[PDB]
Ligand binder design. Structure first.
Ligand SMILES: [Cl-]
Ligand SMILES: [Cl-]
Lengths: 140, 135
């Protein structure tokens, strides 16, 4: 065939493999893979105020989707909403002490996993792919 | 790390676009991808295990997907020549009517995704993704 389907077919396989691994590792601490990625995000960004809109931008998810995800983690006592000084009106996201204990394990994993996943790759391959994915995501 | 995040977004954007297109023809995006594959591979017999290897999906996942396609009258199954113990997957006349529009859609989606890239950059990307899958 003139066209190869490999780029799309393999992007879906790679992404689904990664999200499978994440769920496996996360279910061991009573967490979905996605929730686990949220905890990872907030821990690296404790210095400043993460609003829900900042999370939406970073994970490229809709308000409705972020709304419902954050609701559950609060119910699970993993985060809470706290009044922010940046946006005098909007609530910023904070980790509970329960989520604080998982941080070291999670951040270790989220440097084990992507390290794992990219381990066969050279640095400039990772750089190349990151640049093209960024563009692909913008212009959707 | 930014990589993992971006990989998930780009894959989910693509599944989203595929579903929007496919729903116009009473298909899911994944079902549409199977039609596309079988349409491009009529030169060979495609067993379930072949489709499992090509999409890297579990046997149970494949069973369910193909069963639902057969209920939708999109595929049927006949005894294969390469392995008499297995049946190969074939497109129905119903699915044949969708082949040209699915192939164009998929050709076109890939070209929108790789807009501005040279051929060699697209090949390099495919290879990088294959290598990741094997880590
Ligand atoms: Cl193909
Ligand atoms: Cl056929």
């Amino acid at each position: 065939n003139a066209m190869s389907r490999d780029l799309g077919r393999l992007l879906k396989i790679a992404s689904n493999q990664m999200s499978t691994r994440f769920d496996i590792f996360a279910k061991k601490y009573d967490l979905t893979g996605t929730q686990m990625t949220i905890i990872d995000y907030l821990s690296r960004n404790k210095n400043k105020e993460v609003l829900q809109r900042d999370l939406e931008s970073e994970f490229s998810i809709k308000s409705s989707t972020a709304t419902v995800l954050l609701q559950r983690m609060e119910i699970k006592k993993l985060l809470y909403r706290k009044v922010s000084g940046k946006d005098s009106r909007q609530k910023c996201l904070k980790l509970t002490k329960k989520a604080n204990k998982l941080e070291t394990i999670i951040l270790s994993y989220m440097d084990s996993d992507q390290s794992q996943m990219t381990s066969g790759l050279n640095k400039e391959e990772v750089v190349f792919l990151e640049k093209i994915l960024k563009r692909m995501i913008e212009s959707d």
